[model samples]
Target: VNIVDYSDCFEGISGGAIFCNTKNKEYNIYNKELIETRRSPCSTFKIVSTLIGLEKGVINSKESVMGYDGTDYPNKNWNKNLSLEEAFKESCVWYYKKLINKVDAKSVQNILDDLKYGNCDISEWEGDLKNGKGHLNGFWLESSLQISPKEQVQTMAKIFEGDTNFKKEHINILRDIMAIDVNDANINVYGKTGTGFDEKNKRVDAWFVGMLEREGDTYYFAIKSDDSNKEITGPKVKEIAINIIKKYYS
Candidate 1:
């Protein structure tokens, strides 16, 4: 059984679990509810969007051209053109947004729904620009997708297993997302970072999601916090999570 005691611990110690094993498995959350609270996919949704692009022939590889109109963004500091790999590394919102608009929201919605991530019973915020609802952050989860840590672990685990019941190209597209080795050692790692404002906590939230594969074994991980610490970005958040992995799996 899953056991947890937070009485003596800090008031808001928020984090998720990592599941790694060589056999079929399931995850049990420690202390939480709202298994599928729909929030903005943040950057985590970007993975799914990128996967959709690959599966639907939106692009051939991570080197595919990413053109930006620039009018919507109007940013001189950011590069207007980017390759898929560069866009992913930079987590370029415009790149993903361009793909989403071109890929067609209906089609994108289909993929997410087909994969059991659609918000059928949940609130669908259509045309709400203030919070990016119904247009990327479709579900009203406060700029994040309402997802349970266990469910996310399960989804990524499916991808790692090379199972084709879902889209196969998605499994292939993951080769493009960048990951870092904590100690400069090769360990078959892949990860993604997510961030957005959390209405509930009244602060920004950060997340890191991905897995490590070694010797035919894989581990799925998700780290998140809502404190809005200045030092907490996706990469830095992952650096910390990697250390935790070292403590357990190294």
Candidate 2:
């Protein structure tokens, strides 16, 4: 891993970017301090949870669906039954919560352990873990679970580079779902975004972690913006990450 001053991409934001060239295992990272700070993984954990669900037989395919409980959700995408891939793209909190609920905690932990995921703390929950339920209070969010931007990129690198228990078929299914095409760069970008807030609902943790497959070369990246004093969001960081990606190729 190499520390770098990629400040231009960060500009005025209090965040950083890391791009790892797998061809040489060179990690050019910015904002070294912030990149190493452990923060909630937010929706970004879906990349791993989705794979766990698949291996556990909870989510068998990209089209595997989860039904809504009929409660009104602010996001219209969460109001109806959604396939696994659809749920992923929409960042449907309910769908993923249900997916994790079905997959035993032990199974989730075992996999997290294998990946050496950050903290590896699965004891906390948004709701009562004692009863085992909640809406958006995901363990990966405000709970004990946390991962730094560096670990986020490392985790992505490991999974896509054959370091986990995920089957090729399942990994392939996830890869397709994660694909967000950068037509100008002529590559399909794969990643997930995450956002979290403080008790007052002020946005604090935001992230975009993924691997850029440019033709035959692979570069994994992680971008994060986490500051409770000022607001930042998953979508916001994703746009920034997109700019960084385009610039990297340019």
Candidate 3:
């Protein structure tokens, strides 16, 4: 395994871990303690939402499409009509927010419990009083739902190996939905990025989690970094993962 220290990669104080699991071997970079520290999952929870929506009949299929209401959204990119696949690709907050209504909080809690996701604290929808509407629509976004980097990798591995009761078809649907298009490469990368604030409302966590398929092998990884006083966005975290992939897998 190749070990690299990225303590100075970001301008503010930041730290993270990356766990890689191939069929025959597994390893990780960074301190085990840091990797075990729990934090909000942010948009990466979309993976779990997608599965819950599908299993509970909230989302009929990948072709399921919804139009963005006229509400002003933080990301202008999320303000358009989107199919399931498109929403996943753009990380459209509004789209998932609407889907959350259909699945509802209790169902989401049930699914999370079944999957044993994160700290399993689906409580505290009140954490974000402004938008949560007394529900967990925003739970994973710096609210009550939190997971460690190590647990993220473990969840991905379980999904990859179909170790849980999630239907094989549902797992495959998530895998396909996560597919990323990289040019001139014979490999497929499926990933999601997340960014969120800490309890003090400061930008603190950023994440990129997914699996890579190359040469008929699947590799699961989770990369995360944080800076309490500075913002750590999705693109920055993903760029780190991209660089690592180039150095180690390319």
Candidate 4:
């Protein structure tokens, strides 16, 4: 499908693109270069972090739960302790931040390096960071960790293809937690959404990256929508994706 024909879906937004690939074909809509432009990964990094956590034993199991110590969070749902799956679904920053402390910087950097994610730049920040909790905990959120839409799709494809060197059991756990019911009986979606700010501190870079499974066939996709003046949240990114699926793939 030519996603460029569906540009109206993101009209009035700063910029956006959709990258999709299957066994036979690859499709890129809008500015392809933008797909290679690196930006903060936001919560989407959780997908990789989850695998790292599980592999490093920081997160013992999917069933393992943690407590919320009355810390105030931007999202009300994030105010409570939650299981790994629950935390993933809620996109709770604090939960992942807690897990980050358990997983060392070298381990995370090594994994990203091995995976060849983004520019493979996981360096620490030296100034005030506003997107995430702080410099140490906000690497993926307006810190130093950055990725492009094309690279994001590549990473998700690698994870689904078991090319990231994670054990089968650990990968299975990642898949289960990422499962999403898109309300389409024929397709099952497994993906992650991320929201972060641009260099100008605008909440414009929103991402939805994942795989679409249907009839034993898997297709990898990444959708990134940006709005310089507006907050393009994760759900908005997913909405654009759902529209694309229904219009082109459904």
Q: Number of the top candidate by TM-score?
A: 2
Clashing pairs in 1: 37-146, 38-146, 39-144, 39-145, 39-146, 40-143, 40-144, 40-145, 134-138
Candidate 1, residue 123: how far the Cα is off, in Å: 7.1
Off by over 4 Å in 1: 1-13, 20-38, 70-77, 118-128, 131-144, 165-170, 184-186, 228-231
Give lDDT tens digits, candidate 3, residues 26-97.
665765666778889999999888877788777867777765567666677766777898898888877887
| lDDT tens readout by residue for model 2, 1-250 | 7777666776577788888877787888888888888877878999998998899888799999876779888898889988998999999988988889887778878898888789988887553243344466668876788788888888888899987778999999989999986666587688988877644445478789998877788998899886564557888888888888788654
- The lDDT values for all models are 0.58, 0.82, 0.75, 0.77
Q: Estimate candidate 1's alpha-carbon lDDT, on a 0 to 1 scale.
A: 0.58
What is candidate 4's CA lDDT for residue 68?
A: 68
Candidate 3 stretches greater than 4 Å from native: 1-13, 130-137, 201-203
Question: Per model, how many backbone clashes are there?
Answer: 9, 0, 0, 0
RMSD of each: 4.3, 2.8, 3.0, 2.6
TM-score of 2: 0.91
lDDT-best of 2 and 4? 2
Each candidate structure's TM-score, on Cα atoms with residue i matched to residue i, is 0.77, 0.91, 0.85, 0.89
Model 2 RMSD to the real structure?
Answer: 2.8
Itemize residue pairs with steric clashes in candidate 3: none
Where does model 2 exceed 4 Å of error? Answer: 126-134, 198-203, 228-230
Query: Using alpha carbons, what is the TM-score of model 3?
Result: 0.85
lDDT of 3 at 87: 90
lDDT of 4 by residue, 1-250 (tens): 4547557666555556665665766665666767778887878989988988888888867887666689777777887778999999988877887887777778877899988888766675322255344633566776677788878887888888877679899999989999988888898888888876676765577888888877766778888876775567777888888777777766
